[PDB]
Amino acid sequence: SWQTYVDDHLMCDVAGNRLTAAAILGQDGSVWAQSNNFPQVKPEEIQGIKDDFTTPGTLAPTGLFLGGNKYMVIQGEPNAVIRGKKGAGGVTIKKTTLALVFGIYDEPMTPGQCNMVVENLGEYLIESGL
């Protein structure tokens, strides 16, 4: 089940902290699994994310919007990881073979903790061909 990846491997404890929300979306924008408080992402938001993976610099001028919430784009990895910041909270998006893995964090979870849980699950999925 895609939902087990979210429940057990994104919404798990990391050094005492936990993501606020998480999801796995197809690269078509459809939700394959999500936590309860994960926002409804708009099609144009998904389009900007997909474009930024293959064309870095797409999202930085406008910011990264997730369910209408604006995140400022910060350091990522081309065609692999998008990272955004909103005060002491933020978001990490990891591109896999078929899907996009999202984690949204709030204080006191650190950006490094969010990156670890999201990117490690994404790398597991890539090894599965997913």
Swiss-Prot record:
Q: Whose protein is this, by species?
A: Arabidopsis thaliana (Mouse-ear cress)
Asked if the Swiss-Prot or TrEMBL record annotates the protein with the keyword Cytoplasm, the reply is: yes
Record has Cytoplasm as a keyword: yes
**Cellular component annotations (GO), alphabetically ordered:** cell cortex; cytoskeleton
Give the free-text miscellaneous remark of the entry: Plants overexpressing PRF3 exhibit a dwarf phenotype with delayed seed germination, reduced lengths of roots and hypocotyls, and inhibition of hypocotyl cell elongation due to F-actin rearrangement.
- Entire protein: shown range: 39 to 168 of 168
> What does the record say about the knockout?
Slight elongation of leaf petioles. Increased length of primary roots in seedlings.
Which keywords accompany this UniProt record? Actin-binding, Cytoplasm, Cytoskeleton, Plant defense
**What's the superkingdom here?**
Eukaryota
What does its record list under induction?
Answer: Induced by hydrogen sulfide. Down-regulated by treatment with the flagellin peptide flg22 elicitor.
Q: Which GO terms describe its molecular function?
A: actin monomer binding
Q: What does this protein do?
A: Binds to actin monomers and regulates the organization of the actin cytoskeleton. Can increase the critical concentration (Cc) of actin assembly in vitro. Acts as a downstream effector of the hydrogen sulfide signaling to regulate the assembly and depolymerization of F-actin. At high concentrations, profilin prevents the polymerization of actin, whereas it enhances it at low concentrations. Binding to the poly-proline motif of formin induces oligomerization of PRF3.
- Family named by the database record: Belongs to the profilin family.
| Primary localisation category | cytoplasm
Q: What is this protein's record name? A: Profilin-3
UniProt subcellular location: Cytoplasm, Cytoskeleton
Q: How does it assemble?
A: Occurs in many kinds of cells as a complex with monomeric actin in a 1:1 ratio. Binding to the poly-proline motif of formins induces formation of oligomers through the N-terminal hydrophobic residues of PRF3.
- Tissue-level expression: Expressed in roots, rosette leaves, cauline leaves, stems and flowers.
GO BP: defense response
